[PDB]
Amino acid sequence: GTADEKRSLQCYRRYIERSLNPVYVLGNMTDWLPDELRERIRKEEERGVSGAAALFLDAVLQLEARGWFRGMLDAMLAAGYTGLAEAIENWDFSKLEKLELHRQLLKRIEATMLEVDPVALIPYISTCLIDRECEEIQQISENRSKAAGITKLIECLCRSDKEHWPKSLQLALDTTGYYRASELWDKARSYQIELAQPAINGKNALICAPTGSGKTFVSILICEHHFQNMPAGRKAKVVFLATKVPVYEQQKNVFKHHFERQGYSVQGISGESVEKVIEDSDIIVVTPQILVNSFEDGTLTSLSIFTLMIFDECHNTTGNHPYNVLMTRYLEQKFNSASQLPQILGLTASVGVGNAKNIEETIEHICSLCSYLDIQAISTVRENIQELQRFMNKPEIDVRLVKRRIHNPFAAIISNLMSETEALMRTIDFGTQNYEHWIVVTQRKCRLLQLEDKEEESRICRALFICTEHLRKYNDALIISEDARIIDALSYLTEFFTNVKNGPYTELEQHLTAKFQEKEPELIALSKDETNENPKLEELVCILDDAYRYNPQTRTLLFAKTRALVSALKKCMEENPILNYIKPGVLDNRLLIATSVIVQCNLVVLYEYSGNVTKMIQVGSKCILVTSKTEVVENEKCNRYKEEMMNKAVEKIQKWDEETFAKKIHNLQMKERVLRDS
């Protein structure tokens, strides 16, 4: 109709005025609106973008000229409003409605975006925004400021009328590398054969090989040699036990991928009937607690079903662990029934040392484990040590202690602001990746909320995000101050607030920025001191300078604690006269600086890595570890010793003859039944 088209555009008023910027569709409304109303709208756009979309909508609903409604829809498609043209032409706004939760969220998390680069985001989010929206950002972003830019972008992304946009944003944030905001948006080798041999020869094995040498592989080699040399009637079943839920699934898929094609039935039972799955399957990858339960339960009471049990991370076979509960049952089926037990295969990185002080106590520990599993031989690479070590250069870890900064008054000045800000956030343990993680945890909690008074809830979250964002910055700044120079710390915050100001600059944001600037001139004065020199850093620069004389064609990779620090350290190396010669890159360049997580490289230097290293290092040969914490120097000294002792034990055990070994094991199993009867 005509009086129907004006009633139906009045009832759905809200949706149109909260998406359309009218000054884009006014070129193609050239006939029906006068020239005084196309101008008085564009002066209102300068006050309200939605205020302008309420003056255009008014002076259209009073209009009567020949089918202005058809020129509107044509003009809207003209501007680029495809989801509005469909919404108002099919009278179904369900798509524009479903955005209105994501719009409420974005504004809620806007505090997270401040420092995101709108230019780098534009191509990925382009189909969401209108023609002249895209190019207005670009102007603000270049001419004025990058924060003023991203603020404008997220204005327009709320005024977006395109169901696909929240998805496009998520892929935008993912690909441009803004993981934080994004996450918040929602045939064998020789040594391998050697390892497998005793198990191929039917013996209950415990494969002790290091991680990444390919234990899962040898285990699938053992399998295709188990089905192959399976005698007479008996059909083979195999059980692959894995401790953790993900570990389990990677394997379930490994075995699925490899063995299904050969004709086998490969299923994987897990926490999320046992009987049929087991007898219909040729290979079964499983969580251990599933067997234990469906044994005690009664679904299965015969461990003779399987011809081979593989135990991943088998050093867990002690105490109440289900492997030990499953092997408890295995050991009475050996003793009592004397029927047909399966072959055992144990896979482990390291059999451990328990509480052993000596190689003697260790042997007793290692043996004890082997008893629990009923092992007959411990398989470790011994002939192809050459080939293994080549296949994975376990770096030697030259570990350096390094004196740190005794007083850090910048630190204390920041801490107090963090404490104030926390307590202000309460109205509505610092310098650590604990704190970092705490913010990530607190933020995901505001992302959720969605409680009752959405307007009051909108303001409470908005605020919580501002604060957590600031705390996170301050947090990052302390760290910068402790591993890098104090000027890098100060800078880092200065540059932040200079953004905060260019951003939306909320009532709160003002306060905080103010509260900082109160303290500013102290911090400034701290940077200017020859007192802000940071020996920890001086030591790293001297480790590096030593690392370019015993070899000046060295190609170093240096791991810093945070991102913030990579950029801080980059300056620090540039400015230092000791690494005068060296210009440092970031992730021609012989000193690349990356952060704690495939660049070709020479010597690796971990700069305060809280935790073990060989694991960090795999995502040639030479590796330094600069810590200030003795705790970690005497920790990863205590490991070297316990691993080196374990090996002496294992090789000593390996040099026994079958007889002694199978007997020793057999004793320890016996002593255990003798302590079950008492």
Residues 6+ apart with CB under 8 A from 452: none
Q: Under the phi-then-psi rule, with left for phi > 0, alpha for psi from -120 to 50, and beta for the rest, what region is 253?
A: alpha
The CA distance from 152 to 149, in Å, is 5
Q: Are 160 and 212 in contact (CB under 8 A)?
A: no
> 590-617 as b/e, with b when 16 or more CB fall inside 10 Å?
bbbbebbeeeeeebbbbbbbeeebbebb
Side chain identity at 547, as an amino acid letter? A
Contact 176, 120 (CB under 8 A): yes
The residue assigned the tokens 């990858």 is 285
Q: What Rg value do the Cα atoms of the chain yield, rounded? A: 34
Strands ordered across the beta sheet of 591-595: 397-401, 623-627, 603-607, 556-560, 591-595, 585-586
> 286 pairs with which residues across the strands?
241, 269
Considering the domain 94-186 in this protein, what is its CATH number?
1.10.533.10
The b-or-e profile of 433-445 (16+ CB within 10 A means b, else e) is eebbebbeebbee
Three-state secondary structure readout of 180-239: HHHHCCCCCCHHHHHHHHHHHCCCCEEEECCCCCCHHHHHHHHHHCCCCCCCCCCCCCEE
Tell me the residue length of the chain: 678
Q: How far is CA 371 from CA 196, 295, 363, 406, 669, in A?
A: 20, 22, 12, 52, 6
- Determine how β-strand 238-241 pairs with β-strand 623-627: unpaired
Residue whose C-alpha is closest to residue 481's, from 509, 450, 523, 517: 523
Q: Which two tokens stand for residue 605?
A: 């230097």
Gapped junctions in the chain, after residues (C–N > 2.5 Å):
186, 272, 428, 587, 597, 619
**505 Cβ contact partners less than 8 Å away, ≥ 6 residues apart:** 513
271 labeled part of a ligand binding site:
no
Give the bridge partners for 284, in sequence order. Answer: 239, 267
192 is in an annotated binding site: yes
How far apart CA 417 and CA 431 sit, in angstroms, is 13
Tokens of 408: 């850090």
DSSP state of 352: -
- Token couple for 444: 């995901």
The DSSP secondary-structure symbol of 23 reads G
Residue of 637, 604, 632 whose CA lies nearest to 618: 604
C-alpha 464/C-alpha 458 separation (Å) is 10
By three-state DSSP, how is residue 426 classified?
A: helix
Query: By the 8 A CB rule, do 328 and 366 touch?
Result: no
Does 98 count as an annotated binding residue?
Answer: no
187 is in an annotated binding site: yes
CB 595 within 8 A of CB 565: yes
The owner of tokens 């990863």 is 636
CATH 1.20.1320.30, the chain: domain bounds = 408-532
CATH number of this structure's domain 393-407+533-640, picked from the four choices 3.30.200.20, 3.40.50.300, 3.50.30.30, 3.10.180.10: 3.40.50.300
Distance in angstroms (rounded) separating the CA atoms of residues 612 and 399: 12
Cβ atoms within 10 A of the Cβ of 579, count? 20
In the chain, what are the helix, strand and coil shares in percent, each to the nearest 5?
60, 10, 35
The 3-state DSSP class for residue 476 equals helix
- Quick one: tokens of 52? 């302008």
Tokens standing for 482? 């402790």
Angle at which helices 94-113 and 454-483 cross, to 10°: 30
Are the C-beta atoms of 16 and 52 separated by less than 8 Å?
no
Which tokens is 506 given? Answer: 């909320």
- Cβ–Cβ < 8 Å for 116, 148: no
Residue 85 contacts residue 71 (beta carbons within 8 Å):
no
Residue type, 571: K
- Contact predicate 485/537, CB 8 Å: yes
Q: Which segments of the chain belong to CATH 3.40.50.300?
A: 187-392+641-678, 393-407+533-640
> Helix and strand tally (H, E) in the chain?
31, 13
Write the secondary structure of 289-332 as one string of H (helix), E (strand) and C (coil): HHHHHHHHCCCCCCHHHCCEEEEECHHHCCCCCHHHHHHHHHHH
- The Cα–Cα gap between 360 and 290 comes to 37
CB 74 within 8 A of CB 84: no
Report CA dihedral (302, 304, 305, 308) to the nearest 10 degrees: 140
User: Which residues, in sequence order, are bridge partners of residue 308?
Assistant: 238, 343
Which residues lie closer than 8 Å to 552 by C-beta, 6 or more apart?
none
In the chain, residues under CATH classification 1.10.533.10 are 1-93, 94-186
For residues 491 and 469, what is the distance between their CA atoms, to the nearest angstrom? 17
Any idea which architecture 408-532 has in CATH? Up-down Bundle (1.20)
Please give the CATH number for the structural domain made up of 187-392+641-678.
Answer: 3.40.50.300
Neighbouring CB atoms inside 10 A of 79's CB total 22
Q: Which of 212, 237, 213 is nearest to 223 (CA)?
A: 237
Check the annotation: does 250 bind a ligand.
no
Q: C-alpha angle with apex 36: 35 to 37, nearest 5 degrees?
A: 90
The domain 1-93 belongs to what CATH superfamily?
Death Domain, Fas (1.10.533.10)
* DSSP characters over 500-542: HHHTT--HHHHHHHHHHHHHHHHHHHHHTSGGG--HHHHHHHH
The DSSP-derived string for 87-138 is HHHTT--HHHHHHHHHHHHHHHHHHHHTTS-HHHHTTTTTTTS-HHHHHHHH
Neighbours of 417 (CB within 10 A): 20
CA gap 3, 513 in Å, rounded: 54
Q: Is 458 helix (H, G, I), strand (E, B) or coil?
A: helix
Distance from C-alpha of 51 to C-alpha of 57, rounded to nearest angstrom:
10
Cβ atoms of 271 and 288 within 8 Å: the answer is no
Please say whether the beta carbons of 551 and 622 come within 8 A.
no
Residue 343 three-state SS: strand
The answer to whether 215 is annotated as binding is: yes
DSSP assignment of 112-126: HHTTS-HHHHTTTTT
* Paired tokens of 284: 């079964």
In the sheet that holds 266-269, the strands lie side by side as 266-269, 283-286, 238-241, 308-312, 343-348, 205-208, 377-379
DSSP per-residue letters across 553-620: T--EEEEESSHHHHHHHHHHHHH-STTSSPPPEE---SEEEEE------SEEEEES--S-SHHHH---
Q: Select from 375, 321, 315 the least CA-distant residue to 348.
A: 315
Q: Distance between CA atoms of 139 and 148, rounded to whole angstroms?
A: 10
Residue 337 DSSP class: I
Burial of 42 (0-12, 13-18, 19+ CB in 10 A): middle
Q: Return the closest-CA partner of residue 68 out of 22, 29, 38, 16.
A: 29
If we measure between CA atoms, which residue out of 629, 564, 620, 559 comes closest to residue 594?
559
Rounded distance between C-alpha atoms, residue 584 and residue 575, angstroms: 11
